Design a protein around this ligand. Structure first.
Ligand SMILES: CC(=O)O[C@H]1C(=O)[C@@]2(C)[C@H]([C@H](OC(=O)c3ccccc3)[C@]3(O)C[C@H](OC(=O)[C@H](O)[C@@H](NC(=O)c4ccccc4)c4ccccc4)C(C)=C1C3(C)C)[C@]1(OC(C)=O)CO[C@@H]1C[C@@H]2O
Ligand SMILES: Nc1nc2c(ncn2[C@@H]2O[C@H](COP(=O)(O)OP(=O)(O)OP(=O)(O)O)[C@@H](O)[C@H]2O)c(=O)[nH]1
Ligand SMILES: Nc1ncnc2c1ncn2[C@@H]1O[C@H](COP(=O)(O)OP(=O)(O)NP(=O)(O)O)[C@@H](O)[C@H]1O
Ligand SMILES: Nc1nc2c(ncn2[C@@H]2O[C@H](COP(=O)(O)OP(=O)(O)O)[C@@H](O)[C@H]2O)c(=O)[nH]1
Ligand SMILES: [Mg+2]
Ligand SMILES: [Mg+2]
Ligand SMILES: [Zn+2]
Lengths: 333, 426, 412
C-alpha cells in the first residue's frame, strides 16, 4: 500500500536545551504529532516520540521488512531529514545501540536461517554512495562505476562488488568500511556530515524448493538508504567544495521531491514522475518503481534551527503518504 | 564576462570560419588586424571572444578540434584562417574515420588531453568565464564522438560555467552520411547530459529558408553556415551589448529551461529578406515577430505549429519601443494560445539590445524551446532501430572498442528524451 | 532630515538615472556641480557602466556605484543567496558610510524592480540587513511591480513573490508603479506608441520628485517621510500605496494646461491615470497623501477634496473617517526641457493604499502557483541555495497578504 512513514526524534540536543524552545514536534500519542507555530495535528501510520528509542524504530521498521521478504517483495527504507536529525543514529545505530542496518541484516539472515531448506538464499552485498550524483562502490573504492541500463530497462551500476555474509558480524565489519568509504567532512551542524547518499543493497535470490527439483525463487534486494542531510546556502556558509557538494545534495533531494509528487498523481496517469533526475532515482526506478515495499523514516528534531528542516521532513511525510504504491509481486523461476 | 568557442569536427570547424568571419566584422577585427570598428561600442565588451597580447592582435579564443588535417588546413589556409594562434589547432593526424566510436573512445580519446590542456589555458585567461560555445555535426566521427567528449570533460572541470551547443542534427529528406543516426543518437545522448543550451540546425531547413526566404538559387555551404553564424551572433555577442533590457547566456538559460534535461532550441533570425527587391524595410517590428514566429524560418526541421512552446526568447538588437516590443509579444501569445503551453503565464522572454547587426536597422534572434523538436529525435531514434536491429555498420564501432550495450544506452536515453518532451505538449 | 537612496537592479538603476536626472534639472546643478546621496547596485557591470559612460557620468563617486562583474541571473535565489551575497557587505558599507557622513537622516528611498534577479533577490537581503542596522528609520521602497499581462522574464512571479515576502517584514511603505499601466498613460494621456523605457523612467522620475525632492523642500504644508508611513500605512505589513500624477498632459498636442486645482485633483481618482493596473475595481482607498506643488490655494484644496469626500462612488474604508493627507509645496513641477511632458504650473502626485491591490497581488500570486505546481524553473533556484521551503513558505506568506488586504477592507 502507501509507503509507511515513521517519524523519529532525538533526545534533547545541547542546542535544543540552550534554545529552551518547545520541541518543534511533540507527539500527543506515539502516532499523533503536534507541530509548532499553530494548532497542528498530524497523524501517521506510526510516529515515535523523543523518548521513543532507536529500538522502537528497529521493531517497527523491520516488521514490514520481514513481511516484504517473506512475500519476496523488495524492501526499500528511506531515512530522510536534515543533518543532525537522526538518520545515522537510526540507520547505523548509536555507537552502543545496534543500528537498523545490523538489525535488518540480522532480520534477513534470520528470515533465510529460520528456513534454510525451503529457502536457500544467496546473499550478495552491494554498498554504494551517490556523491555529486556520481555513483561509487564503497567496498571497491574506484572511480565512479559507469551507469548502465539492463537489456529490457532499469538502471544498474556494473562492478558494484558483491560479498556473501560470512557471519552477520562480518557484514558489520565490511559495512563500517563502507560507512568510512562514503565521503564525509565535518560541519558546524554535525561532528561528521555525510557528503553523500549511501545505499546498502543485497542481491537475495532465495530459491524456495518444491518436489524433487525446485519451486519458485523469491528475489529480494533490500535497501537501506542513508540520505545525506540537506543543507542550505546560509546553513553551508562556506563556498567552494562545501557549497558545490551542498548544492549537489539539494538538487538530488529536489529531484526526489518532484518524483514523489509525480507518483501521487501524475504517475497514476502515466510515466511522468522523473526517475531520470538523479542517479539514485534511476536505480530506484527498478527498486521501488519495480516493486513494493518502501518505508520512510522521517527523522526530525526539536531544535529551532532544525524547524525548517523538520517541518519540510514532515512536508516530505505528507508527500510520501500521498504516494500510494500497490504491493507488487517479485518472483523468479 | 567571457566565453570560449569550440570548433569540434569538420562541420563545427567549417562553421567556425563563418561564425568568426561574421562576429569579427560585428567587432571590426580584420584578419590579424585590430579593432577598425566603425564605432567605439564594438570594443568595450569584445573580451567575451578575444585576448590582449600585442595591441592590434585580439585573437579569437576558440578551439579547433579535428582528426582530419586537410580540414583545419583549409580553414587556416584561407581568409580569416590566419588569426587563430597556432596553439588553438588541436589536430589529430590519425584516420578521422566517420565513426562516433573512432572519435570518442579510440582515436579522439588520445587527442583529448592535448585539448583539455588548451581549454584550460583559455578558461584561465582572465576576468570571469561565463561558458563555452560548441559547434559540430551529430553525423560524424570528430563532430559527434570527439566533440561530445570534449564537453563531457568540460562539464566536469567547470559544472558552473554554461555550455551552449550548436548541433547540426541530421537533416531528414537526405542524409549526407550513412551511419548518421549512429553518430547522432550517440552524441545527443551526451548532449542531454552535459551542455545546458542546444541550438539544433538542419542543413535542409536552411536550404528551404535560404532558397525561398532568400530567392538564392545556389545556396553554397558557405551560405548555410553564414546564416547559422548570423543567429549565434544575435544570441551571445549581441547580449554582451547594452540594451534597455539585456540578458546574457544565463538569463537565456534561466528563462528557457523549465526542466534540467537541457532542452534543445531552434534558432530563427529576424530580417530575412532577399537582397535588392525584397528590401521592403517592413521591419517596424510586427514584421520581425511576423518573421521569427512563422513555421518556415525556424532553422530546425520540425515545424513549431506541430507542438507547443515552453519558452521563447526574442533577443532583439536594434532601437525599438519597449512598448511595441512587449506589446507585440502578447498578441502573439494570444493569437496562438493553442500552441504555447499554459502552465507558463508568460512563455516569452523579451530581450532587447540597442546596437543592431552592423549594416541593418533592426533584427531579433529567436530561440524557441518548443515541444515540436520531439518530432526530430523521433526521426533520429527511428533511423537507429531500423538499422540497429540488423547491426548494419556496427562492426566499425565494436571493432573500434565499443559495446553492444552502448548503442542500446544512447538510443534509450535519447528515446526517453522524446517521451519527456511530450509530457508538456499535453 | 535626509533620505539616502539605493537603486538596485538594472531597472532600479535606469529609473535611478532618470529620477536622478529630474533632480539636478529642478535644482540648477548641471552635469558637474554637488554630490549625490545614493548608491547603485547590480550584478551585471554593463548597466551601472551606463551611469559610468553615459550622461550624469561625473556627478557620482565610483564608490556609490557597486557592481559584481559576475552574473545577474533572472532568478531571486542566485541574486539573494549565492551570488548577491558576496556583494551585500560592500553594498551595506556604502549605506553605512553615506549614512554616517550626513546629519540626522530619516531613511533610505530604495529603488528596485520586483521581478528581476538583482532587483528581487539582492534587495530582499539589502532591505533585510537595513531593518536590523537601522530599525529606527524609514524604509520606503519604490518598486516597479510586474506588468499585469506584459511581463518580461518567464519566471517574474517567482522573483516577485520572493521579494515581497522577504521585504514585507522590513519595509515601512512600499510605493508601487506598474510598468504596463504607465504605458496606457503614454498611449491615452500623452499619445505616443513610441514609449522608450527612458520615458516611463521620466514619469516615475516625476512622481518620485514629488515624493522626496519637493517635499523635503519647504512649503505651505510640509510632509516629512515619516509622515507618509504614519498617515499612509494602517498596518505593519510594509503596505504598498500606488503612485499617481495629475497634469500628465502632452507638451505638443492638446493645450488646456491651465487646469485649476478643481480639475487636476479629479484627474487622480479616474483609474486611467495611476501608474498601476490596479484600476479601483472595488478597492476602497484607506489613506491618500495628496502632494500638491506649484500655485495652490489651501482652500482650493480644502474644497476640491471636500467635493471628492462626497462623491461616494470613491468609497473610502469604513474605519477611516478622513484619510486625506494634504501636502502642499511651493515650487511648481519641472518638466524635461524637451521630452513629452506638458509643463503645468501645478500638479498632484497622489499616492494611496487601496484595497484594490487585493487584485494585483492575487493575479500575481496565481501566476506563481501555475508554474510552482509544475516546479517549472525551480531547479534554477534550488541549485542556488534555496529549497522547497523558501518557495512554499513564501507562498503561504503572500496568502495572508490576500487575506490581509481583504480583511482591512470589504468589511465594517
Ligand atoms: C545594402 C544592404 O543593406 O545589404 C544587406 C542586405 O541586402 C540583406 C538582404 C542581408 C544580406 O545577407 C544575405 O544575403 C545572407 C547571405 C547568406 C546567409 C544569410 C544571409 C547581406 O549579405 C548581410 C548584411 O548583414 C550585416 O551586415 C549584418 O551585420 C550581419 N552580417 C553578416 O552576416 C556578415 C556577412 C559577411 C561578413 C561578415 C558578417 C550580422 C547579422 C547578425 C549578427 C551579426 C552580423 C546586410 C545587412 C546586407 C548584405 C551585405 C547584402 C540579409 O541577411 C542579414 C544576415 O542581414 C538577408 O536578409 C537580410 C536583409 C538585408 O537587408
Ligand atoms: N519603468 C521601468 N521598468 C523597467 C525598466 N527596466 C526594466 N524594467 C522592468 O523591470 C523588469 C526587468 O528586470 P530586469 O532588467 O530583467 O532585471 P533586474 O531587476 O535589473 O536584475 P537582473 O535580473 O539580475 O538583471 C521588467 O518587468 C521590466 O519591464 C526601466 O528602465 N523602467
Ligand atoms: N535519536 C537519537 N538519539 C540520540 N542522539 C541522536 C539521535 N539521532 C541522532 N543523534 C545524534 O545527533 C547527531 C547527528 O546524527 P546523524 O544521524 O549523524 O545526523 P544525520 O541526520 O544523518 N546528518 P548528515 O549526514 O549530515 O545527514 C549525532 O551525533 C547523533 O548521534
Ligand atoms: N551547415 C553545415 N553542415 C555541414 C558542413 N559540413 C559538413 N556538414 C554536415 O555535417 C554532416 C557530416 O559530418 P562531418 O562534419 O563530415 O563530420 P566530421 O567531419 O567526421 O566530424 C552532414 O550532415 C553535413 O551536411 C558545413 O560546412 N555546414
Ligand atoms: Mg547523516
Ligand atoms: Mg540587470
Ligand atoms: Zn488653456
Amino acid at each position: 500500500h502507501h509507503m509507511k512513514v515513521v517519524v523519529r526524534v532525538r533526545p534533547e540536543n545541547t542546542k535544543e536545551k540552550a534554545a529552551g524552545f518547545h520541541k518543534v514536534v511533540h507527539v500527543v500519542d506515539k502516532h499523533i504529532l503536534v507541530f509548532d507555530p499553530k494548532d497542528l495535528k498530524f497523524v501517521f501510520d506510526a510516529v515515535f516520540d523523543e523518548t521513543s528509542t532507536q529500538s522502537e524504530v528497529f521493531e517497527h521498521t523491520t516488521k514490514p521488512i520481514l513481511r516484504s521478504f517473506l512475500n519476496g517483495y523488495n524492501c526499500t527504507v528511506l531515512a530522510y531529514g536534515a543533518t543532525g536529525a537522526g538518520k545515522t543514529h537510526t540507520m547505523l545505530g548509536s555507537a552502543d545501540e545496534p543500528g537498523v542496518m545490523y538489525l535488518t541484516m540480522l532480520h534477513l539472515y534470520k528470515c533465510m536461517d529460520e528456513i534454510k531448506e525451503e529457502k536457500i538464499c544467496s546473499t550478495a552485498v552491494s554498498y554504494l554512495e551517490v556523491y555529486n550524483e556520481q555513483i561509487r562502490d564503497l567496498l571497491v573504492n574506484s572511480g565512479p562505476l559507469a551507469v548502465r541500463e539492463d537489456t529490457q530497462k532499469g538502471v544498474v551500476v556494473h562492478g558494484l562488488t558483491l560479498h556473501q555474509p560470512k557471519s552477520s558480524e562480518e557484514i558489520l565489519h565490511l559495512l563500517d568500511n563502507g560507512n568510512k568509504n562514503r565521503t564525509q567532512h565535518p560541519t558546524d551542524m554535525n561532528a561528521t556530515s555525510s557528503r553523500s547518499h549511501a545505499v546498502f543493497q543485497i542481491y537475495l535470490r532465495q530459491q524456495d524448493k518444491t518436489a524433487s527439483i525446485n519451486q519458485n525463487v523469491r528475489i529480494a534486494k533490500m535497501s537501506l538508504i542513508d540520505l545525506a542531510g540537506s543543507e542550505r546556502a546560509s546553513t553551508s556558509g562556506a563556498k567552494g567544495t562545501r557549497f558545490v557538494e551542498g548544492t549537489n545534495i539539494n538538487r538530488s533531494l529536489l529531484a526526489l521531491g518532484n518524483v514523489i509528487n509525480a507518483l501521487a498523481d501524475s504517475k497514476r496517469k502515466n510515466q511522468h514522475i522523473p526517475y531520470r533526475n538523479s542517479k539514485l532515482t534511476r536505480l530506484l526506478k527498478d527498486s521501488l518503481g519495480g516493486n513494493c515495499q518502501t518505508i520512510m523514516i522521517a527523522a526530525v528534531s526539536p531544535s529551532s534551527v532544525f524547524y525548517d528542516d523538520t517541518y519540510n521532513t514532515l512536508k516530505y511525510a505528507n508527500r510520501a503518504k500521498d504516494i500510494k504504491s500497490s504491493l507488487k509481486s517479485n518472483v523468479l523461476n | 564576462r567571457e566565453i570560449v568557442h569550440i570548433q569540434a569536427g569538420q562541420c563545427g570547424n567549417q562553421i567556425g570560419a563563418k561564425f568568426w568571419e561574421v562576429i569579427s566584422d560585428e567587432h571590426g577585427i580584420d584578419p590579424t588586424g585590430s579593432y577598425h570598428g566603425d564605432s567605439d561600442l564594438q570594443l568595450e565588451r569584445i573580451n567575451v571572444y578575444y585576448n590582449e597580447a600585442a595591441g592590434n592582435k585580439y585573437v579569437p579564443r576558440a578551439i579547433l578540434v579535428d582528426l582530419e588535417p586537410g580540414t583545419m588546413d583549409s580553414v587556416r589556409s584561407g581568409p580569416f584562417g590566419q588569426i587563430f594562434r597556432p596553439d588553438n589547432f588541436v589536430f589529430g593526424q590519425s584516420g578521422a574515420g566517420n565513426n562516433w566510436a573512432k572519435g570518442h573512445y579510440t582515436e579522439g580519446a588520445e587527442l583529448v588531453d592535448s585539448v583539455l590542456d588548451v581549454v584550460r589555458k583559455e578558461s584561465e585567461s582572465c576576468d570571469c568565464l561565463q561558458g563555452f560555445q560548441l559547434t559540430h555535426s551529430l553525423g560524424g566521427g570528430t563532430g559527434s564522438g570527439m566533440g561530445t567528449l570534449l564537453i563531457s570533460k568540460i562539464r566536469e572541470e567547470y559544472p558552473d560555467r554554461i555550455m551552449n551547443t550548436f548541433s547540426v542534427v541530421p537533416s531528414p529528406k537526405v542524409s549526407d552520411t550513412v551511419v548518421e543516426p549512429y553518430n547522432a543518437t550517440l552524441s545527443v545522448h551526451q548532449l542531454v547530459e552535459n551542455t545546458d543550451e542546444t541550438y539544433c540546425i538542419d542543413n535542409e531547413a536552411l536550404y528551404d529558408i535560404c532558397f525561398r526566404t532568400l530567392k538564392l538559387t545556389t545556396p553554397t555551404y558557405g551560405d548555410l553556415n553564414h546564416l547559422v553564424s548570423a543567429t549565434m551572433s544575435g544570441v551571445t555577442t549581441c547580449l554582451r551589448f547594452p540594451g534597455q533590457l539585456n540578458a546574457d547566456l544565463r538569463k537565456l538559460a534561466v528563462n528557457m529551461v523549465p526542466f534540467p534535461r537541457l532542452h534543445f532550441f531552434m534558432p530563427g533570425f529576424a530580417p530575412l529578406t532577399s537582397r535588392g527587391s525584397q528590401q521592403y524595410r517592413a521591419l517596424t517590428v510586427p514584421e520581425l515577430t511576423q518573421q521569427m514566429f512563422d513555421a518556415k524560418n525556424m532553422m530546425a526541421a520540425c515545424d513549431p505549429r506541430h507542438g507547443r512552446y515552453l519558452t521563447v526568447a526574442a533577443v532583439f538588437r536594434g532601437r525599438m519601443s519597449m512598448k511595441e516590443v512587449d506589446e507585440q509579444m502578447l498578441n502573439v501569445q494570444n493569437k496562438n494560445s493553442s500552441y504555447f503551453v499554459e502552465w507558463i503565464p508568460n512563455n516569452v522572454k523579451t530581450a532587447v539590445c540597442d546596437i543592431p547587426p552592423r549594416g541593418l536597422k533592426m533584427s531579433a534572434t529567436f530561440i524557441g524551446n518548443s515541444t515540436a523538436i520531439q518530432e526530430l529525435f523521433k526521426r533520429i531514434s527511428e533511423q537507429f532501430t531500423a538499422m540497429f536491429r540488423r547491426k548494419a555498420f556496427l562492426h566499425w564501432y565494436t571493432g573500434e572498442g565499443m559495446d553492444e550495450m552502448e548503442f542500446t544506452e544512447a538510443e534509450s536515453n535519447m528515446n526517453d528524451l522524446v517521451s519527456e518532451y511530450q509530457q508538456y505538449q499535453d | 532630515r535626509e533620505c539616502i537612496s539605493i537603486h538596485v537592479g538594472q531597472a532600479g538603476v535606469q529609473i535611478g538615472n532618470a529620477c536622478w536626472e529630474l533632480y539636478c534639472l529642478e535644482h540648477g546643478i548641471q552635469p558637474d556641480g554637488h554630490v549625490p546621496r545614493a548608491v547603485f547596485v547590480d550584478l551585471e557591470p554593463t548597466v551601472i557602466d551606463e551611469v559610468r559612460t553615459g550622461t550624469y557620468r561625473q556627478l557620482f563617486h565610483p564608490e556609490q556605484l557597486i557592481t559584481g562583474k559576475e552574473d545577474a541571473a533572472n532568478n531571486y535565489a542566485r541574486g539573494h543567496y549565492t551570488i548577491g551575497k558576496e556583494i551585500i557587505d560592500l553594498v551595506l558599507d556604502r549605506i553605512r558610510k553615506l549614512a554616517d557622513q550626513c546629519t540626522g537622516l530619516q531613511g533610505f528611498s530604495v529603488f528596485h524592480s520586483f521581478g528581476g534577479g538583482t532587483g528581487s533577490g539582492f534587495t530582499s537581503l539589502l532591505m533585510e540587513r537595513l531593518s536590523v542596522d537601522y530599525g529606527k528609520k524609514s524604509k520606503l521602497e519604490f518598486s516597479i511591480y510586474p506588468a499585469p499581462q506584459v511581463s518580461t522574464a518567464v519566471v517574474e512571479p517567482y522573483n516577485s513573490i520572493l521579494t515581497t515576502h522577504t521585504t514585507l517584514e522590513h519595509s515601512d511603505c512600499a510605493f508601487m508603479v506598474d510598468n504596463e499601466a504607465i504605458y496606457d498613460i503614454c498611449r491615452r494621456n500623452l499619445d505616443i506608441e513610441r514609449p522608450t523605457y527612458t520615458n516611463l523612467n521620466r514619469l516615475i522620475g516625476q512622481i518620485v520628485s514629488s515624493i522626496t525632492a519637493s517635499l523635503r523642500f519647504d512649503g505651505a504644508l510640509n510632509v516629512d517621510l515619516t509622515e507618509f508611513q504614519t498617515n499612509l500605512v494602517p498596518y505593519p505589513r510594509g503596505h504598498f500605496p500606488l503612485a499617481t500624477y495629475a497634469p500628465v498632459i502632452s507638451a505638443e498636442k492638446a493645450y488646456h494646461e491651465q487646469l485649476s486645482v478643481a480639475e487636476i485633483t479629479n484627474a487622480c481618482f479616474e483609474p486611467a491615470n495611476q501608474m498601476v493596473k490596479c484600476d479601483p475595481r472595488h478597492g476602497k482607498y484607506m489613506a491618500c497623501c495628496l502632494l500638491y506643488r506649484g500655485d495652490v490655494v489651501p482652500k482650493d484644496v480644502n474644497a476640491a477634496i471636500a467635493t471628492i469626500k462626497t462623491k461616494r462612488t470613491i468609497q473610502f474604508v469604513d474605519w477611516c473617517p478622513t484619510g486625506f493627507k494634504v501636502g502642499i509645496n511651493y515650487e511648481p513641477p519641472t518638466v524635461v526641457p524637451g521630452g513629452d511632458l506638458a509643463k503645468v504650473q501645478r500638479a498632484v502626485c497622489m499616492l494611496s493604499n487601496t484595497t484594490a491591490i487585493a487584485e494585483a497581488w492575487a493575479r500575481l500570486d496565481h501566476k506563481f502557483d501555475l508554474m510552482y505546481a509544475k516546479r517549472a524553473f525551480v531547479h534554477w533556484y534550488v541549485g542556488e541555495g534555496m529549497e522547497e521551503g523558501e518557495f512554499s513558505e513564501a507562498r503561504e506568506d503572500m496568502a495572508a497578504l490576500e487575506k490581509d488586504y481583504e480583511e482591512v477592507g470589504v468589511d465594517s
